[PDB]
Subunit: 822 residues, 2 copies
């Protein structure tokens, strides 16, 4: 079952009913001001910091879900309805919502009145704009009144929801019914004290009335769906004093048959320098100059239309670096549009706010910053370089990393600390990705401090050295890296030993020392230590590179012996040196992470897909038998049915959810890539479709969440809810899946010395063309594909056959045509 | 306008409409299990810790307010309604809610069917019980289905509202439709891991069906007022797997005209020792022995009735220590019932959870702990003694105190720390009050550590010494105490200098040192410094005592000179030595706290109420002229109209709210006590009626909150909302007003050597009798009162006239009749 369809031409998802399985959202804003917006106009906006600068209030776990947002109550002769369906839930003759790139439109019609609203954050503005079009679709005259509505938040959302002892007495507003281009309301809570900012909520016409007090607009004992003011048919003109400020205007709208009217509403964020705060000598009236200027740039449909077209041009030009054309329009839409959009949004939003993440936490993982980079470095390489320098500057001098990074402050979280021993190597991963994409080896000479300490600067390359050496000097009894608090898997806490509720599994370590080791870090060391070695050699450090290849070699031996269970890689050794991820046990026999990543690193790979005695093939075959499902590969199997106190968070989930038997879409890509590595393209693409949004659209009633973006986790086979997704949008899944399909399935991936063209996608995509822009040139790669396991691409560059899979980088400006046959 | 009335005989407030100006609540539970219950059945319950063991979920700032609780959906031939009115809001023929002591009843009737629900937490049980009586009041036969409903919380309420990325996957239940006395649901989230507790939700009859999944019961896109399952008329028998667990049973109820039916529902909290968690060797089934036992003690109406009757005995026996009988039945009910109820509830609940405090924070002020004591010590002296020892044990060796005490752990909060220089003297206040009430001087010899350090114990009395000496060695340039981060006034922060939003005004000190001084601590030192000297002398430390009297003398002089502005006391000297609270300024001319406290201490008191040249009378006359209003006395005047960066939080509130011009009901008692001290009874009683719930009941439409308990703050004269209250129930206002009416207006107060009888209440209460139980005897005090300013009571004891106002304590068991004339 579907609840809409894609519109590829318009680069939108078109939702054709209000009755989706869950609220489906979009993100607006591409610089500093962001909005979450559901297909029912739910959500909120904030400037930079969703915790400390939220303009508007939103309730998570509302009954029903998502029943606050930007509403427009229509009163047509005493019948009240909203085009967003919620909150009033009147029967509409028509409904559609379209989520596009940085905008959405929502349209509702009832009793001969159509209302369409376009919501977007314009480039260069800290504001959410709504262009509303009202149309009389009947054969008689209409007299309407439209009441806009938005509920303010008192800026700090944490305080807003908890400190009512103070904050029910601080709500303040100013009202401006005769504003230079219409009518406006200013929310200025705490402007009298330390805030240099306020919010403005305005419309570009004379409002017949206004309301700034929720309780007055909505009425006692009422829900938003039963708001009294709209039902009365006129604003109460209320002025807030404490309690709950809102922004609402009534606008009178008369229409002949077939007539329409346009209106432009603006919700804006405004900051004044300290010495320009006040309009008046007595300091009681906010200085609205900047607010009037913003409102003057959106006083007409014409100006609003142009901003929308500049928006569209931003995204069209943004997503013009990698594209594909094929027989598979599901593949194409994901690759060309929705996967790249999703990766940009993860850049912008980090892990801040979604309909699952509540916007109070402002950090993200160090490892997430680097990994997210892999997916967007082709779109915004200068922002990427900056990011890398930013996070490397927080790194400790011993090479250890802050586990949590705070993008807003460019600092590591001191409360959480360090100790997650996979963190340091991800910096090599990011840096190398950046350099391969851009060729900017100069980043390695950039002076970068440790723990942001002035005077401590060394070249970025040296930070790479400290990351590498950290692993070498932190190994256990079998030569595998010590795991510390956890590795990529935040729930594998082998030094925790917690029996007290409330204690954090990640940072509590009730016993010290121990010999706990991770095979994931081992694979990560083999993969990224080989990248560091390459950078070192290229840098001219011959010895450094050679010792590095030495430790890497040692680590691949360690993995194939002490890291190997017989038919798959162990997951770890625990605090007392007993194995985890062994068929010797009833539960947790096989874990996916090491299988994927170790093979990605080339460990155990033999002569080809038919070399079944190769450890890589045994492992991937074991993954197929034991972990694969119709909805993806689960994390481990069997799942644990009782608490394993020696293992931390992992067994606290019911079987089949999150880290205890969940499908993490973030780590499936590691096995998809591994499958292309050993030569089984068909299998790899199979696995990719099972977790990818365009292919899961036909089972929307099962996925539940948005059919146009990846989610973090799909319920596993041991769950009653097998197939249902949670934690949509903000996830590393986007990046890793883009890397997988663009670089390994389609096979186009930048190297230091050239573009590698190495497709492995199997028989389902017989013909396709990739257009890639790299180091200033365009590469048109046309591929004819038999899909045979083990068949690799032979290249013809500009008419002449070449050996190998590497296409040397052409001068900027040029166009290189590559033909590939396999 | 009123929304109900007191039923004095029943010791209940009777709310006769659902349409109150705000949700009005009661508290259930007297030992370790507590419930908040509104007059619409809203609220929640928890065991000990409202942050970390909350059984059920409640949404603050819901639209509408308070729309989740313990509901019973009635389906009468397809019509669905709830007796609590909300959430369905169907028209009822009758509605009533009665809030009594530790119990409430709610009754609703619609179309020939009446439902009465008694809610209470039984003594000796960790459970909320509901006795439901359903009655057919029509002339026709009824066949109904009743659906119970409650929404579970995932125990840690902070996590519950924030960490959805984990917690939408962990909800677990078990269902037992064939329970030994009916049907039961178990909420067992995280029992598989670290939790040794679960919740049970049960009814004492065979349920037709059940539901444990919210979204199934309620339905997509619906509010609780619109729940699908009740409207369908049959349970869905949903079994939760993640998302939102609930407890619901359907029960069939057929009734002939006039016929009734009784049902008992239990919501219980259960812990099992770790050895006994599981019923099965595979560790998948909770051990239900303890829940079956609880359910067996409430399997019948008769059992329920006994338990209810034992609760009543609990409260009847406990409120038997102070009582009054007068012409004034508003006075009587506050003194006899509501003020004392409120005081016990603050002991029980601290400052944790109300409809304004959200139950996430679990501390209270060190100062609040001592002050609250003053109000409950006569009821529960054995618990009082314990509390004093617990809080004293956190005190630092240099005499400083933790500003925030955590009652659940008996520790100070280490994050907030110390530095509020009024804190240490409140320990003397608490300890003296305890000793005056009980005569237990032995508490002074108890060994008590500092900062809960082993080995550090010294006698309690020595803690009093360190508190005293702390002020002596922390005075400023004028001899007055250094204020530190703040004093009683949390918002007077003279060492903050904050210009950054989000920084705490109480703990941030952007400047070090300075010379900021407080006249409030000065007064506090004269009052409790003398209380310490008295204890020192009685203990035989004549030199110690005399030295203390000397420092106290110096301080009195310093208040009367450097602390004196001309017609009133200053409030403070700021960081640079400039005065605060002087007529020389345009705003903040006079502040109430020093005026009350200093006169309470006898500073400036003259020869009588006619001695209008005495500084106490000038100060109090200033208070009357500049601070008093129809609703109480505001904190200061005029309020600040712009931000005073040198003063902290005070001027951030708009004029007339909280600490900027608000009425603090907590500090009004100080001026009320001071008026009795100087001899102006009518004036003191005037002020007391202005802020007291029984007297404000007739303006409930202005007060807004509960007409039966004190609230922290009533909006001041400079507020548009002058008269409206916020922050009801959990406040020191209760204790201080109980002290005021019981010990100074009515005039009966314990001393070390006897009971003082010194009424000072004015002409409005011409005659009255106080019955007081003290040191094991009953004092029967009959008063004839002219109410003349300056007239003090002359006493006859058991028929014989005596001098002075002190009645020496009789041996226990005896009864003493004291006649008083003034």
């Amino acid at each position: 079952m579907r609840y809409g369809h894609f519109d590829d031409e318009a680069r939108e998802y078109v939702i054709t009913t209000p009755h989706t399985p869950y609220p489906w959202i979009n993100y607006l804003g591409s610089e500093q001001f962001f909005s979450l917006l559901s297909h029912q106009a739910g959500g909120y906006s904030f400037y930079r910091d969703a915790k400390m600068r939220r303009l508007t209030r939103y309730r998570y776990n509302n009954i029903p879900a998502d029943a606050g947002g930007r509403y427009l109550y229509v009163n047509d002769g005493g019948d009240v309805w909203t085009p967003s369906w919620l909150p009033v839930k009147a029967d509409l003759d028509h409904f559609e919502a379209r989520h596009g790139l940085g905008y959405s439109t929502i349209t509702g019609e009832r009793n001969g009145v159509r209302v369409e609203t376009l919501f977007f954050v314009p480039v260069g503005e800290n504001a959410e704009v709504q262009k509303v079009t009202v149309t009389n679709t009947s054969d008689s005259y209409k007299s309407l009144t439209l009441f806009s509505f938005v509920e303010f938040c008192l800026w700090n959302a944490q305080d807003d929801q908890t400190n009512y002892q103070r904050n029910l007495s601080i709500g303040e507003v100013e009202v401006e019914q005769e504003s230079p281009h219409g009518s406006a309301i200013y929310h200025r809570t705490e402007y009298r004290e330390r805030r240099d900012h306020y919010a403005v909520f305005a419309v570009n016409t004379q409002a017949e009335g206004f309301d700034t007090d929720r309780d007055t607009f909505v009425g006692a004992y009422n829900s938003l769906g039963e708001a009294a003011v709209p039902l009365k048919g006129e604003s109460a003109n209320s002025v807030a004093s404490g309690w709950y400020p809102i922004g609402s205007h009534s606008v009178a709208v008369s229409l002949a048959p077939g007539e329409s009217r346009e209106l432009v509403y603006v919700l804006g964020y405004v900051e004044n320098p300290d010495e320009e705060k006040w309009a008046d000598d007595a300091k009681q009236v906010v200085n609205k100059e900047r607010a009037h200027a913003l409102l003057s740039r959106f006083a007409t449909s014409e100006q609003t239309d142009a901003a929308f077209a500049a928006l569209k041009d931003y995204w069209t030009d943004l997503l013009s670096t990698y594209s594909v054309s094929s027989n598979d329009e599901k593949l194409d839409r994901m690759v060309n549009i929705w996967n790249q959009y999703q990766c940009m949004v993860t850049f912008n939003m980090s892990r801040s706010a979604s309909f699952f993440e509540t916007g109070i936490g402002r950090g993200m993982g160090f490892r997430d910053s680097n990994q997210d980079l892999l997916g967007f470095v082709h779109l915004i390489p200068e922002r990427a370089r900056e990011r890398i320098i930013d996070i490397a500057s927080t790194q400790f001098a011993d090479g250890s990393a802050y586990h949590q990074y705070q993008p807003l402050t460019k600092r590591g979280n001191n409360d959480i600390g360090s100790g997650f021993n996979d963190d340091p190597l991800w910096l090599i991963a990011g840096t190398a990705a950046y350099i391969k994409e851009t060729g900017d080896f100069s980043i390695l000479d950039e002076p970068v401090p440790f723990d942001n300490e002035p005077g401590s600067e060394v070249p970025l390359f040296e930070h790479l050295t400290r990351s590498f050496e950290f692993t070498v000097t932190h190994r256990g009894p079998h030569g595998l890296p010590l795991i510390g608090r956890a590795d990529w898997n935040d729930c594998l806490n082998l030094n925790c030993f917690s029996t007290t509720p409330g204690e954090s599994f990640q940072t509590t370590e009730n016993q010290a020392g121990g010999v706990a080791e991770s095979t994931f870090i081992a694979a990560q060391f083999v993969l990224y230590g080989e990248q560091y070695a390459e950078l070192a050699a290229r840098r001219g450090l011959a010895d450094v590179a050679d010792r590095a290849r030495g430790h890497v070699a040692e680590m691949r031996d360690a993995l194939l012996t002490d890291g190997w269970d017989g038919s798959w890689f162990l997951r770890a050794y625990d605090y007392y040196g007993n194995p985890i991820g062994t068929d010797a046990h009833d539960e947790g026999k096989i874990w996916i992470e090491p299988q994927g990543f170790a093979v990605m690193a080339g460990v155990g790979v033999g002569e080809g897909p038919q070399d079944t005695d190769a450890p890589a093939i045994k492992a991937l075959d074991s993954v197929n038998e034991m972990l694969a499902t119709d909805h993806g590969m689960v994390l481990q199997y069997p799942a644990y049915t009782t608490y394993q106190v020696h293992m931390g968070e992992v067994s606290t989930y019911p079987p089949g959810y999150k880290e205890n038997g969940g499908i993490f879409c973030h780590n499936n890509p590691w096995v998809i890539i591994a499958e292309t590595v050993v030569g089984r393209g068909g299998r790899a693409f199979d696995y990719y479709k099972r977790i990818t949004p365009a292919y899961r659209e036909d089972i929307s009633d099962v996925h539940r969440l948005e059919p146009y973006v990846y989610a973090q986790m799909i319920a596993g086979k041991e769950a009653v809810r097998h197939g249902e997704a949670k934690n949509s949008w903000l996830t590393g899944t986007a990046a890793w899946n883009f890397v997988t399909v663009s670089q390994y399935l389609l096979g186009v991936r930048p190297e230091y010395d050239g573009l590698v063209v190495d497709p492995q996608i199997g028989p389902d995509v017989p013909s396709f063309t990739v257009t890639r822009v790299a180091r200033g040139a365009t590469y048109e790669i046309t591929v004819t594909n038999s899909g045979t396991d083990g068949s690799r691409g032979r290249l013809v560059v500009d008419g002449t056959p070449v050996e190998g899979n590497l296409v040397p980088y052409a001068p900027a400006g040029s166009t290189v045509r590559v033909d590939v046959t396999l």
